[PDB]
Assembly symmetry: T
């Protein structure tokens, strides 16, 4: 059972666009948690490379927040109701957070970031599958661009770790 | 017992700058919750004036996130450890959130925003008191600018409601 | 019989891309009329909110004219011939115009704008159906972005009226 | 009987500023038709020089639309009611349109453009005469700048045709 | 006896360009008072719409101060001596000021602004009459642009009040 | 009896922040008069150096008007009511104005400017004393920046006169 | 046997995304050759129109190099290995090059450019077919935008030659 | 016999717009000579104030060259033929030039500049008279703006000399 | 006897840097005449291509005027005295001017421009020879950049004529 | 005996603001030496990370030079006389310099930078103490911002070294 | 036999500027290959530092392509014919390429880049020698700037490797 | 014995580019001292003209610091080791500094600045001689541009003093 299959089953468990609204709302929660995690790296990182990795985190954060704006506004537009409290984000996100600590290595931060973007790219694939199923071309394009951007991020972060993208 | 006295007692309940670190960390949690609340207004608002109030929320959000950056980075700099998970923000913030609903009136959203900024200005006053007490001039200036900005926001939001600032 | 079905039947009534050229040309006529209608609101509106709604009309107008440029140029590119006289626009558009009057209320102008964008989003859906049918991926993307943009406009205009998007 | 005399008689045929309002409204209709004609050249032109003449048409179009904004807004301001439907523009304009065809030569397009600007400069002269007559200095300045700009356009378009301005 | 006739008689009551210098100097005083009045609206306004009307006042203020610069510098240039103390502005202006109060309604502020611009447009008409009389083409153009701008402001402010321009 | 002592006694002669509101309001009046005086130099100056001193006056004017905005808005925010008529500014300001004359020397204009900024720096010192007394940290910072800026201006204007700052 | 069928057979002749990687790599080689060909026109062209066609070549070159960046980076991201030597580009490209000569006419250069973009649009169609087949939505969007852009270029270059797009 | 009367007689000495074309052509010659004279000041000046007067000359030069562009292009547009050789400029200009010398004082350069702008303002007045006479509103506006600009320059240059404008 | 030899003999015919000052001064005169000639093309040109060649002339003019600034200022700097009257430019320039006429063909204008730049490049070569001879490295670099720029202009203008550079 | 106590004793060893002037002058000398030291790192560094650390040094240098400008100008303004020769900077600075060598490691350069900023932050604390003592609010704010900025720099440089700020 | 001597012998092996044209053409081929090699590093690099070295490659690439433009255009201008096919670049370049592989270390990529720039700086020295020999000052300046830029690149890349420039 | 001969003898007193490295290093020391001297003028100047001469000093300072960057980086690049401590600059510079005093006249400051730039231009001439001798074309160009810039500065500063350049 792949991650994509697990996400799909979970999103669609509980109108003609109910699954699309559900996957968008899952993305509201996951993007909010992902942003928090990236912010934690920005704050807690120590080690050689800090001076270029620290501002890189701010760029990733801005990009995640732009995804959140587009996802939430698309959800409102198609007749849904986005999660909009920190407790909802935390409860419904499939991403876990841990207490910040300065003793995490640069390598650990980079590994966690890759796990986050791998998760997001899988969520977006489920988004693609659902929007094709329900015939929402606009939301399909949103998930396409978000997946493409995530995959590029994985390539570059993996390269910094000395690895290939391994999608 | 004033709000300022209540915040002070709560912040200092549990080095030479322990109270300053605690009030900065309280601000990390409160700013993160305040941003979430403002975002909720941006998404859920309906009614005449939406077309200027909606982008106003994005400006307030950007300003709150800039406060968060400065507060968290100041806390790291003076030897502290900022809250950095959504669960920590939600648990330690003194601001409550409610589930988003489209049936809240414009007037209700404006009233909630004023309550949020009144709370923040009081927190910043406690920040002023603590930093004077512990002799942290840099952090005192941070809380001064944040309080001044909050008070200006209260004046303008109150004026939109047809009221005076009533600090 | 839905609006989408009615538009489709009308567009395809009278090469391998004849239906795509026809729906693009329908959009040339409808966008030209829509721009005229928006301009009428810009000129004739009176009432509280004028000072933000008036420039909003100029933004909508610019956006409609940008759609017209892209639609007409795509039509030329794929071997068609765009309508290019005011009489052709008026005759072939499915949007009606009325003589300007200063006695229309702000609420009436907002209602008319929503009707216009609802119509356009339906036309774009027909555009999606036709381009999928004829295998024109480039023109399909054009109609996707135009529909997404129209749906966002409907959400925001509806919110100003105190309503949900009701797509 | 000159073109200027013919335009004057026609404009004034059917308050202290009735003739000024009529000539401004004639300009609303003529500018809307002129813009349509210029757009037709932008779309249908084929032949050597396309790559600089095509963007030139977009510049002329922007300039005509700016004239329309200023004329319509001046008309509203002085107590009039601008034409605001495509049928009104087409019916009241003294400029004729023809169905677009790709078989028109570059030379034919340039000749038509010169005829359009010659017509507009004559309309503006009537505008000058009427506003002097009725003592509207503000509207007189508007027609002065519009005539000056039209005359410059005629010089440059004529030069491209190998001719003098021949005003 | 019209407002224009009253202003003319008053301006010319007490070289070849004495009347032109007098009307320019009247404008120095009136623009300085008008700016003060607009600033009062910026500060004292309360009520729905504040968030767009408040910055609108800053735009009007900047525009009035730009008129003042051009009028005063033109007066110096043609051999005059502009009023240059607050007491002179207050004494010679035909605009009255009242003590600021927060209890004025938005509608009252908009009504006062329209009265101010109506007065200014009449002053500028007298400026036109005087400069035509004395053959000062440069100063005539200054008053023409100022009148045109004032008339546009009246249209837009009147529209916000739900009214026509009623020049 | 120093100028600072005289200003303090006068400001506080006639809630927990009454003295702060009074000194801010004194600054509203003085800044409005100072701006008028600077404008007079801009207009009436003749002599070598005009071509750099004339635009310098516009820079000083812009800076004084920015102080006025910040002072007036701070006063509104903390629950006060700023002077907002030319008669109030003139009556309550401690700065005197004189009728403009072209026969004042460059040296006289520079001397007057230095007197104005010396006065303002003393007013700001009283502002510092009062805000420390009443515990208004935000308003204290406003007066600090204004005093610092005034003192810099005095240094530079004094240097142009061939003198030291002599604060 | 169409050009599209020939390209497909050739690309797929020698994981779940092998055909997508192959068509992207074909595009690496073809874009590198296309850029070289365009550069040759920039350098060797002589004749009337040079002064606008010469900079047009630099715009086309920049656009081709931007396609190359996006194609190569997408190929790396999805687990491939882009051609990255001039010998590989030359060997695997289906575009032929000829030695530069100043004796080629403007018309010959324009004809060659159209052949190049026709070839590229066909390659992109194969890219569309392959990515639909293998379910790569991100790469499908890349080929869609590239095809749309190529088709627009063909329209404009054809128009300069006095011809229709003839896709 | 005033300078204006002398210029008029000279310009009109040797169609319905012959006098307008003649005065525009006189301005071509005079502006070309004026620019040369200003350039001479830029190069040859020595003395205190050089560091601000030297760049001032470049600003005046740019402004004179912009007048030349507008005058020459207006002349072409209305059916004339501008002087276009240095010998024609020198022969027909009413401004004399002298060999450059470093021994001219700053005061001498400023005096010469004022004479040049006084001459130009008189030429522009003749331009006003002629264009009113021949009914060329567009060219009348050109001369109005040029005269206004010249008069402002005279005020500022005179002020630098310690004098009033003395138009 | 080459053009370079003829220019050298003429420049040096009538301190340690006398020849350098003479060749710079020759360039003052020639650049002033060249600018006049280019301006004549800008004004008098008629024929296909006008719309791109006309603004090209303004670019060439700006570039020639920038050369003039650098040459004249270098001449002043090294102890010389630049020509600074139109009569001096005309008398000492080796470039001839002819009365403007609208009947010159585009081809004739392009041929004349090439002759002008060929002349200038030869003058600059003499400048190179003289500055090498007299050991002025700074002035040598000035002539190097000017020659390089002239040679580029010749290539591009020649290409527009359908020719090679033929330096 | 802390570093702060040692700096204070040394600064105050040899009017009402003598200690403030002395500590500002100490900062003139120390900032000039600090800038020199940072420049040495910019030039002499070798090792992995050079390509981001090298430009980082230019940013630090610009920031130090901006501190120097503000400190020196504040000192002049309050009646002092800044050190203004390299010998004075070197003699009075408490920072030592060493001859540049390419054999210093990246880690050594980072350690030295941290020592420099630690020293500066202590100097600024003494500046805070002295300005509080002498009642100079303006200079106190200058030292506050400088200390805050230094402390931020220490956090970031320490993080690059893999360490906490350890203020 | 030095690299410079070997390049010279090879370039000049097979008019008055034949050697200059040959060395420029050698540079066309070498710059095209160098750009390809740099692009390969951009694509294939993996390892710590990727996130700053990857964009560094794009900067180097842009700079190499700017050299190519200037070299090729200079060659055309002086009467030559630049290589303009990928096969010509590959055949005539003295730089070898290897198939891209992800297994090359960061250190290997940096070493290869240094070899490339060392080669280019030697080629440019030959360019200097040849242009001095043939008296082409313009082309000599081109090679001077290119060599200087290459030498700077070698210093910075060497520093990243922990080495001195070792030219 | 000229200044140039004295500088040469001194620089070369104590590889194939030893003299070039020595003269560059002399320039490191002299530019650092020159910047200090210019900064002293910026701070200590009093007298008429301060308001334009003070910012002029900041422009000169920026330009000197840009020379220092280019000289030091060139020295590193060609295998040298730049002076990098204030004591080295002071010891090896041939420019003397004096204690700052407010009693120096504007004329004295201008005279000192001219002496500094005269010295620098002579140093640069020695730089030219040495780099020609050792065959360093890149460093020769650096000294050429620096000398040219210095000579321009001398012309302009001398003109402000009422003098010719007297190089």
């Amino acid at each position: 059972n792949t991650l994509v299959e697990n996400i799909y089953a979970s999103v669609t468990h509980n109108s003609k666009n109910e699954k699309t609204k559900a996957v968008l709302n899952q993305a509201v929660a996951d993007l909010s948690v992902a942003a928090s995690i990236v912010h934690q790296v920005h704050w807690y990182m120590r080690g050689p490379g800090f001076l270029y990795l620290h501002p890189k985190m701010d760029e990733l954060l801005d990009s995640l927040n732009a995804n959140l704006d587009e996802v939430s506004e698309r959800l409102i537009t198609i007749g849904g109701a986005p999660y909009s409290t920190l407790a909802e984000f935390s409860k419904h996100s499939k991403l876990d957070e841990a207490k910040g600590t300065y003793d995490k290595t640069v390598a650990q931060h980079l590994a966690r970031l890759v796990e986050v973007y791998l998760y997001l790219s899988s969520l977006y694939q489920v988004g693609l599958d659902i929007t094709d199923e329900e015939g929402d071309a606009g939301t399909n394009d949103l998930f396409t661009a978000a997946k493409t951007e995530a995959e590029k991020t994985i390539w570059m972060l993996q390269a910094e770790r000395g690895q290939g993208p391994a999608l």
